[PDB]
């Protein structure tokens, strides 16, 4: 589910979370933020061992 | 008898006629097949869209990107708003078939874009089960909803029949060309054809049959339309959906 | 974290004191098990038992009431709850030292 | 082949024109065949959807499409000329799609359409927010989800300060324009973040 | 049951409610499954989930999944994929689950015939979050709604507020 990085980021762009605006843009089924991969790269690049 | 046509009244008074590839795709049971000398210049595809008839674009005189991006703006000019045309593509033709959907998916592109092209046609052969669905589903998902297939003889004719059973739920359309057509000549009478088929046809209920090929004076085309073709051969009325 | 939960609850339908107490109680205040455990032999508890998931408590207490003469029971496991229920099988209470 | 009237007219068309251009129909991309029930109680037939909740009320000779996407509605507008009775598309006029993206970007974006984005100057949007650290720990425990080994750096990585600021992008895009034409509200719905 | 029979004529008993890390969902789903608590346990978790609408968007933020205990036991007795253990660990997701399996425990004792409100135990021992079901027992069960309540609301809080502190499990080392 992808309603808490809606909620923690700030844009609640429908087709990543709601079923019918998927369908109505044209998607199977909703998909995650572009910008949720933007930071999970950041995170990954700037993570400590 | 069932499958005879029926004749309906339009809102503004019009009286037309009611075959199941009128119901199925809103347009006259007239079809302009897609012709690779004539029906490759927009004007006469544009004007009988225009009329509410099945218009076809030749994919043979499109041979390169220019020319056929060419011939979609000047079709979405002259086309006026709501209406919408089909497009022939030829299947056995290694490079324009490439070009246009198979490699350069520019049929596909020009749909997403937002071309009025609500529908393909397969001629020049059928491809086997696999790749045909495929396409299939390809093209119905880009938002196409029309794949025609136009089988010569009896076997390719049976292919599309298993095609059809393949996918009971989404319809198919067939042209079934006689030999007395045009251009390229195939050596099988029309009437041989939809005796051997026909039963098979019918038998399942996705499948539209439009035929073609000796098709001259709308008289043959009425007599064929409503099954009393069969009568000479002694049969019962055999009524089809629709002619090219 | 306690202000969190007051500002949760008043915004809900439910009360606040005890929603603050509770927070307190159960996220900043220590803990103290060994007199509370004495608190409990002190009332008189005979037996005690830990109805929380599985059995960490009974492990946990076991060294805490090992030589008081306390009985100890599981609760919501198999075999805690056929100690309970069955007549010949309960568990054994070492002699108090 | 159990309902008439503009309901069926929508209901069948596969194609509409979206804004100058023709695209799926949004009834048929909900659910395609036959899966819309009717009813003709009081004569003012209705098609509704279990699974989206979709409907497909009549205002008299018009039809219009009412989709719940989180809380709210979004309505689209269908005019039907007199072209549409054989072969033509339903079209989708432009200011139908500017009300329907307008309400999916105050979705998006805060709680309605009307005067609550922010506002655009001559050329810019602006907003003025709250900034709390700690909300970037809340962030990040959201977003860096790893294995064992790894661990969040001490400071914050730069993907933070674009939270407070999506009203204004959104508002941007409600205000873009083209060369003579907008980019808000034929396309909204298949607006994606490119890089 | 001769043990019971004792506790019922009388003998000084108490009740100790257990803490946290304890896998509350293995224990739950046998409770569940042995007795038959689901009816219950499903109107309580509808009524907590009615009485905390309001605050649903703050506390979507800590629980990746959403906290439907019965669906994961549910899935469990059918020998379905459960939740991670690192997301069943999870505060906002822990300490009312805990809760929760107490909860099943004390209501499947008394349907066993272990009734604690004709002998009251002699001692309320509460461990480190036990104290809300000591809360919970120390009344009738016409409490239970409002402390699973407030219980989701506090492990949801302590996770958001342990992640904004250090306090939070870095990697391994808890």
């Known amino acids: 589910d992808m309603r808490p990085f809606a909620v923690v980021s700030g844009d609640h762009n429908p087709i990543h979370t709601d079923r019918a605006a998927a369908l109505l843009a044209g998607l199977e089924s909703p998909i995650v933020h572009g910008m949720w991969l933007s930071a999970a790269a950041q995170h990954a690049v700037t993570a400590t061992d | 008898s069932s499958y005879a046509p029926t004749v309906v009244r339009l809102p503004d008074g019009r009286v037309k006629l009611s075959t199941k590839f009128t119901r199925l795709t809103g347009r006259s049971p007239i079809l302009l097949a897609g012709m690779t000398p004539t029906t490759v210049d927009a004007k006469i595809v544009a004007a009988a869209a225009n009329a509410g008839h099945w218009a076809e674009l030749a994919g043979g005189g499109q041979v390169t990107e220019e020319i056929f991006g060419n011939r979609i703006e000047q079709m979405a000019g002259l086309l006026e708003p709501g209406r919408t045309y089909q497009f022939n593509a030829l299947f056995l033709d290694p490079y324009l078939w490439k070009l246009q959907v198979g490699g350069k998916r520019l049929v596909q592109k020009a749909r997403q874009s937002g071309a009025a092209i609500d529908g393909v046609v397969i001629s020049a052969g059928i491809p086997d089960l696999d790749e045909a669905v495929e396409l299939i589903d390809e093209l119905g998902d880009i938002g196409i909803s029309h794949v025609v297939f136009k089988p010569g003889t009896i076997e390719q004719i049976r292919s599309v029949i298993r095609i059809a059973t393949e996918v009971p739920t989404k319809p198919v359309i067939m042209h079934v060309e006689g030999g007395r057509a045009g251009g390229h000549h195939s050596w099988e009478d029309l009437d041989d054809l939809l005796l051997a088929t026909y039963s098979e046809l019918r038998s399942r209920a996705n499948i539209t049959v439009c035929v073609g090929g000796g098709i001259g004076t709308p008289r043959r085309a009425a007599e064929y339309l409503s099954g009393r073709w069969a009568q000479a051969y002694g049969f019962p009325l055999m009524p089809i959906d629709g002619i090219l | 974290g306690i202000d969190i939960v007051a500002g949760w609850a008043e915004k809900a339908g439910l009360d606040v004191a005890l929603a603050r107490e509770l927070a307190d109680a159960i996220l900043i205040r220590k803990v103290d098990w060994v007199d509370e455990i004495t608190r409990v032999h002190a009332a008189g508890a005979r037996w005690i038992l830990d109805l929380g998931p599985g059995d960490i408590l009974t492990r946990l207490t076991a060294p805490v009431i090992r030589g008081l003469g306390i009985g100890i029971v599981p609760a919501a496991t198999r075999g805690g709850q056929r100690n309970l229920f069955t007549v010949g099988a309960t568990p054994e209470v070492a002699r108090a030292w | ?195 | 049951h001769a043990l019971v029979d004792r506790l019922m004529a009388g003998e000084p008993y108490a009740v100790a409610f257990g803490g946290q890390g304890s896998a509350w969902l293995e224990t739950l789903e046998e409770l569940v499954s042995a007795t038959g608590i689901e009816t219950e346990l499903a109107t309580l978790v509808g009524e907590a989930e009615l009485l905390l609408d309001p605050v649903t968007d703050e506390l979507i933020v800590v629980r990746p999944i959403g906290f439907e205990p019965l669906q994961w036991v549910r899935a469990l007795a059918a020998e379905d994929p459960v939740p991670s253990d690192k997301h069943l660990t999870s505060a906002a997701v822990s300490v009312p689950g805990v809760l929760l399996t107490q909860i099943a425990a004390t209501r499947a004792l008394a349907r066993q015939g272990m009734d604690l409100v004709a002998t009251p135990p002699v001692a309320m021992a509460g461990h480190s979050q036990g104290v809300l079901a000591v809360e919970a027992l120390k009344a009738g069960g016409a409490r239970d709604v409002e402390l699973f309540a407030l219980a989701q609301l506090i492990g949801a809080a302590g996770t958001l507020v342990a992640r904004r502190r250090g306090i939070s499990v870095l990697g391994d080392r808890p």
Do not use: K, Y
């Open chain 4, 1 to 195: 082949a159990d309902v008439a009237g503009p309901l069926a007219v929508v209901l069948d068309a596969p194609d509409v024109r979206w804004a100058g251009r023709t695209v799926t129909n949004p009834v048929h991309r909900i659910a395609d065949p036959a899966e819309w029930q009717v009813h003709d109680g009081p004569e003012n037939p209705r098609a509704t959807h279990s699974s989206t909740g979709a409907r497909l009320q009549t205002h008299g000779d018009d039809v219009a499409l009412s989709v719940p996407v989180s809380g709210t509605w979004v309505d689209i507008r269908f005019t039907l000329p007199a072209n549409t009775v054989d072969g033509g598309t339903p079209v989708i006029a432009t200011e139908d799609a500017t009300s329907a993206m307008r309400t999916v970007l105050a979705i998006a974006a805060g709680v309605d359409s009307p005067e609550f984005l922010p506002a655009v100057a001559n050329g810019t949007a602006t907003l003025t927010v709250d900034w709390h650290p700690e909300r970037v720990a809340d962030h990040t425990g959201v977003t860096a989800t790893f294995g064992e080994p790894l661990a969040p750096s001490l400071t914050n990585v730069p993907d933070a300060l674009v939270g407070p600021c999506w009203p204004a992008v959104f508002a941007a895009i409600g205000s873009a324009v083209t060369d003579t034409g907008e980019p808000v509200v034929e396309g909204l719905l298949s607006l994606v973040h490119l890089d």
